[model samples]
Target: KVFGRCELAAAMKRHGLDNYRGYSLGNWVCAAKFESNFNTQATNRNTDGSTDYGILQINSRWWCNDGRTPGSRNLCNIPCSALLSSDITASVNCAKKIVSDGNGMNAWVAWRNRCKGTDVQAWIRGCRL
Candidate 1:
């Protein structure tokens, strides 16, 4: 499922992306924008046999277990398929676990390249909280 900006904002907000680990809700919104354009089915494969999954493009190398990435830590303890659903609670919760593990939002290349070091309030503009 593809989500609009406001829809993504509301979902992430409901699941605690707001200021968790000192990142603004907009920052998470920005990451989702660049990572997968808010598409729940988005996936990108890497040369390392790892795949990025779902809205946030969470990696199989460390987070979800796709049964492909070698030695998958399954850090998020979630199956990769779970992130591909229109219901985004798994993606949002997994992202929180990623940041809570001290990696912060930059764990995502999209965030590091597009969202980091910027004021991301624009990503959530016009959203009613």
Candidate 2:
């Protein structure tokens, strides 16, 4: 799988999900789970044959990786290897920029639909990454 649970969890916490509520969070987490198998370092080949990179499946060459903080460049703005380090907080914050701009809740909804079942909602607090 993506092997990103621990990192994502830390990312959530750093982003102020201490209470850990909201299906949106669950949705976002699950979307990444499916997209990258939770691997912070995941990259992909999309239907267009272009490449998608990092936990949120960012496109590396989007000209957004200049660390622009989501206005134009966000979502895995930081490198995958950088996200993989214990420093995902920085990357997560950066990534949220793009997500918040567009498809923010949709990303979370994708995750919640994928991972949330009967026990999932309650158990989410225990999930890492």
Candidate 3:
């Protein structure tokens, strides 16, 4: 599903994304916006032997097991396909797992390049959590 801006924000917040790991909801929203354009099934395979899956673009290299990523740790302990679902429960949980890691939200390069240090509220404009 390609979610509306606030729709995705509402969903993310419902799954405990607000103020997660010192990152605001806007930050997460912004990251998701760029990573997948709010499409639940968005995917990207890196040339470096890993693929990113879902709205938040969780990585197969370490976060999820795709049985395709070489030496995948599957640290999230979920199949990569689970992240592509519209429900986003598993996807959000896996994202929380990612932020829980020491790297924080920077684990996703899109977050670093686009969301960080930007006017995050614009990502959630009129969404009013």
Each model's RMSD to truth, in Å?
1.0, 5.7, 1.0
Q: Would you estimate the TM-scores of all the predictions?
A: 0.95, 0.54, 0.96
| lDDT of candidates 1 onward, in order | 0.90, 0.51, 0.90
Per-residue CA lDDT of model 3 for 8-59, tens digit only, reads 9998998999898888889999999999999999999899879999999998
Distance from true location, Cα of 68 in model 2, Å: 19
User: Which scores higher on TM-score, 1 or 3?
Assistant: 3
Ranking of candidates on TM-score, top first: 3, 1, 2
Candidate 3: regions farther than 4 A off: none
- Deviation of model 3 at 107, angstroms: 0.7
Model 2 alpha-carbon miss at residue 119, Å: 8.4
lDDT of 2 by residue, 1-129 (tens): 244555565666667643333434655555566656776667565564445655666554442343322444334445434544434454455555545554543444434455646343442466654
Off by over 4 Å in 1: none
